Amino acid sequence: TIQPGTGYNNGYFYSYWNDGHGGVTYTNGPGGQFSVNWSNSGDFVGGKGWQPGTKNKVINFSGSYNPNGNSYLSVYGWSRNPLIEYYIVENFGTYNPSTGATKLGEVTSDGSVYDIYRTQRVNQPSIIGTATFYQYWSVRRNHRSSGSVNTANHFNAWAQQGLTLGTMDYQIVAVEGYFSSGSASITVS
Template sequence: MNDTPAHPTGHRRRRTRLLISVASAVFLAAASLTVAGTAHAEADRTVTSNTTGTHNGYFFSYWKDSGNVTMNLGGGGSYSVQMNGINNSVVGKGWNPGSTSHTVNYSGSFNCGGNCYLALYGWMTNPLVEYYIVENFGSYNPSSGATRLGSVTSDGSTYDLYRTQRVNQPSIQGTATFYQYWSVRQQHRTGGTINVANHFNAWRQAGLTLGSPNYQILATEGYQSNVSSNITVSEGSGGGGNTGGPTSGPTTGGGGNNGGCTATLSAGQKWGDRYNLNVAVSGSSNWTVTLNMASPSVVSSTWNVNATWPSQYVMVGKPNGSGNNFGVTIMANGQWTWPSVSCSSG
């Protein structure tokens, strides 16, 4: 392998991308793997050399180019890994094929202070695309040197969107020229729900072409760093990708003007068990917006707002420096009526 940079700057990512692509091509070409349910739970398994396979109904991938990497495959979608003295390594558990519209739940721990990250990683074909939804990373931002295409707000944070291109480099289809799509979370986390459709829809709306899903894993990656993680991944209930609002409730609405400002609701993404609402405030930049839920629906996450909950079914939001537009995710719990909303200045 050589040290040619992957992006206009930042030679580390080129090596990382290149080596991952080689591993994917070699080991995915070696076997055609699909996720199949197991009749009984498989025993825990320790992996210390390059391989792919299935374990307890999940696809897994292990790859390193040097150093000590121990991956322990546990029950269901769980795995843990210790990386020491490595140059580059990536491991993870997920699905083959993956999906552009499901929800991914994950939890656990991720420890790294160097060049490493935690991401939902995968490939598409027709066209050939390598992609990352980066949830957490160390001292090196994996999108360094890439061109920013915009952002998407999902699951309580803003993700920055990027695209890079690899020219005549190894891939799951041999040596090829292909794009890499990136969605990098601004507020790092190690656990939560990834509404995968939000990211693929954002890439599409940014003018990027999507292909057919290949494999997809919740990956731990390290480059010349000591890394450890303990991750459990699963598929969430319901699917993503619908663009309407809930099954009942206004298309816009607001409670209006209780004291110098107006809050207006509009529909965001909708899934089988939850939906997003966008809240636009006008008339004041120093506002207090109150949402009253229709029981038993509750707010599960927010973005671009300082939120408090005086009670289980009431949310109060104030500006957090991100402007006069914010959003909420509401768990329907069988109740799809939108909340009532009011706004006051100060």
């Protein structure tokens, strides 16, 4: 278990962030493994991967993901210039994060169709400070907690649609929660 922060563990970058409300623990395990256990949490994100990510990584993940309430399991990361927060959502809990969002197309990858969306965060926290920035989403129709994500298929479809990415910052497989409960154990490579 670690303080919220970033660093490296067993060859993998990790990021663990929370809002200080309590109710969530994040643990780094061997190799690319991490666990999250939460019960009436606040807002949080944690997981393992790479710093920087790339635009053609094939990301493999496997494990168990058991949210009770609002949570996502995604390939998650940022670009700079432009500042973008992006998600390739493989599974979620009570809330589909694209609800009410503008649909920007579809892409087929790794055994499922994904729906593509763009949203905007206004004066919200980010990797560079408070900012207004777009988020890009691919939301998998057929939910799962193991698989392979060919990120190029998503990034290329986004680019085709005008959702351009700048220089990649970190890129992880993340469990995100917003005032929920759950458990998860995920191994990345």
